Amino acid sequence: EEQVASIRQHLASIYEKEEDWRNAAQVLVGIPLETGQKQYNVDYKLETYLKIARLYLEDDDPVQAEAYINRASLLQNESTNEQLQIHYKVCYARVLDYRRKFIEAAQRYNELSYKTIVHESERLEALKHALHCTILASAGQQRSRMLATLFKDERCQQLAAYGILEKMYLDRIIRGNQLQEFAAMLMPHQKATTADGSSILDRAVIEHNLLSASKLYNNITFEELGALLEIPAAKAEKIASQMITEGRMNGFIDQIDGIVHFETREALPTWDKQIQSLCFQVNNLLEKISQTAPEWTAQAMEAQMAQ
Template sequence: MSAKLTAVCALPQKEQAAAFVALAQDDIFSKQPPSMASDLRALVDTVVNTDSVGLVVGRQVLSELVKILGDGVVKDVELRKTLVQETLAVIQPKIVSYEEQVNILRFQLADILEEEEEWSEAARVLMGTSLDSGQRAMADGDKLRVYVRIVRLLLEDEDSVQAETYYNRAALLVHSTNDKETLLQFKLCQARISDYGRKFLEAASRYHELSYVGEIDEEERQHMLSAAVTCAVLAPAGPNRSRVLASLYRDERTLELPTYNVLSKMFLDHILRSAEIKSFEATLKPHQLAKIAISSNDRLASAAGQDDDAANSNEPAASTRTGPSTVLDRAVMEHNLLASGKIYNNITFRGLGALLDLTPGAAETMARKMIEQGRLRGFIDQVDKLIWFEGSHEEDNAQGKAGGLGDVEEAEDTGAPFTKRWDNQIRLTAANTESIVQHLAEKGLVSLAA
C-alpha cells in the first residue's frame, strides 16, 4: 500500500484525486477488515499530510471517502465505526481545512452511537461539529436540528444541566424553521427540560398539549398524557395546579391511566393515603424521586415548635419528621393540607402534624409558607396553636350556582361546612320550584294531577 500511495503522489495534481479514489475503492474497501482500517488510515494520512497533495485534491478525495462510508459499502457496523473514528483522528490536527468533511463524519459517527444507545457519547460527538464557522455556512434551521438532537440525546441519559445549555441555544433559532417534526421535537424537549428542572406545572401543561397532536403515534401520546398527570400531581399545591388538574380530570383519556385514582383524589380534594402514594411512587422516574433539603430556618422552626409543644403536653409527638424528604412527599403533604381545609374549619398544630406525618412545628411551618405564597387561604393562631381555614369566595359562588341552578338567593353564611350550605341551597331551590308551580296552577297554565 505504501508503494501505491507514493506512486499516486508522483502523478500530476489533476490525476491525483481520481487515482486516490480508485485506489480506495479497488484496494481498500474490497479487502478484509484487519487490513482495511490500517490501509484507509495510511491513505487519509497521505492525502492530508503530504506536501505534494494539494488542499483542493485533499478535499475532493476526503469527500469521496466520506460518501463511500455513508453509502453503507462497509456492512459491518463496528468496522464502519472504527473507520470513521480513525479517519477523524487523522484529520483532527488540520480540521480547519476540512471542516465540512469532518462534520459529515461526526454525523455518521453519532448515528452509529445512537443506534448502539450510547446517548451521551453521541451527544459529545455532535457537540464537536463546527456550526458557526466553516467553508460553507450552516443554515439556522440545520443548526436548530443539531441542537435539538443534542438535547434529546443528553436527556436520554438524564444529563439535564448540559441539555438546558443547548436547549437555550435552540430556543434562539426556533423561529427559523416551519418543519413540523423539528418543532415537535423542540416542544417535547421543552416539556422534558421543565420536568427535570422540577417546573412541574409548566411540564404538565406542555405534555398535555403534546398529547393532542395528531402527528404523534397513539402510544407516544398516551405516554405524554401519563407524564402530564405525573407532573401535575408533583406540582406545588395551589390554584394554578388545580386548574391543570381540572383540565386533565376532564380529559376522558385519563380514565385508562393507572394513575387516574391519584389524579381524581387530587382534583376532588380527597386526602391521599400511604398505600395510594406507594403505588404512585412506583411509576416515577429517578429524577422525580430526588431528595430535597430542608432549609436551616425551617429546621430550627420545626424543632422549636416541637420542643414547645412537648413541654406543654403529656402526649408524645406522633412523628419526628421535620419536613418532606422528596418532591412527591412535599406534593402529597401540601395536597393533604389543602384537603383538610375542605373538611375542617380549623385544626391544631398537633392534629395537622398527625395528618401529615410531621412534627407540630413542621406542620405549622408548611402551613405558614403556603399562606405566605397565597396557595392556602387562612391564618394561624399561635397562642391557641390553631390553623384557621378560610373558604374562597369563588368556591362559595360555585356552590350557590352548581348544577345549572343559576342565580338563587344565598342563605346567610353561618360558617357551616360546604355540605350544609349545599343542603340549604337544595331546600331553597325546591321551595322556589314549588312556588312557581303553584303560581302557574292558579293562572290555569298547568293542571296538577290528583
C-alpha cells in the same frame, strides 16, 4: 468530506446502539458540525441541531442547551415538511421538563397531545407527561387551570396518575401509599429535593392535605392531625402555624390542650343555608314529578290553581 463523515456516521450510530450513554459525551465531536465550509441544506442542519439536543440531555447540560435550541427555533419555523415540527416540539418539551420548568412543559405537552399527525400511543404519552408535569408544578391558580383542563379530559382516566389528579383538583386527602406509588413511577430528574432532602413534592402534598382537612374538621388535635398527615405532632403544629400565619388558611391554634380551630359556621347563617337547600330539594323534586308524568302533572296543577 461528505462521504467520509457519512461512512463513520453509521458505524458511530451502531456503536452507540449498545445503549451506552456514557459515550454520548464523545459522540458530540464525532459529528461533523462545522468542519465543512459549504452550507448544507436547512433540513439537515435542523436535524443535526435537534439530535444534538437529546444527546446533551443525557449529558446533563440543559442550561446552555436552552439558549442553544432557542437560537435555532427562529430558523426552525421554516423548511419543515411535517416531522420537524413534531421533533422540535418534543425536544422543547423535554428540555423544559429537565430544567424544572414543570408548568410550561405541562402546557406544551398538553398542546402536543392533540396533534393528529403523531400516533395514538404518542398522544397518550404526551398526555401522561403533561399530567405529571402539572402535578409537579408550583402552587398557584395557573397550575389550577391546567388541572381543571386535564380533569375535563377523559383520556386522562386511563393514566396511572389519575387517582392523584382527581384528589389534587377536588381538594381531597392524599394518603401515604398513593404518594409512594407516584414517587416510584416518577423520573429521577423530576424528583427535586432542595436543601436537606425536604422533597418539594413531599412538602406540597403535606400542605395540600392540611388545607383539605380544613373542610372536613371543625377543630383537630395535634396528635391526630399528625397521624392524618403522617408526621410527628410537633411538625403538624409547626406547619399549621406557618400556613395560618401568612395567608394560606383560616383558624387559630390553642396550645394548652392542643387543638387547631378552623371556621366555625355560625348558627344563623347555617340555618339560612339549610333553608335554601331544603327549598332547592323541593324545587328539584317538583321538576322530577312534572317531567316523569306530564299528563298527571297537568291535571294536578289544574286542580288547585283553578280551585
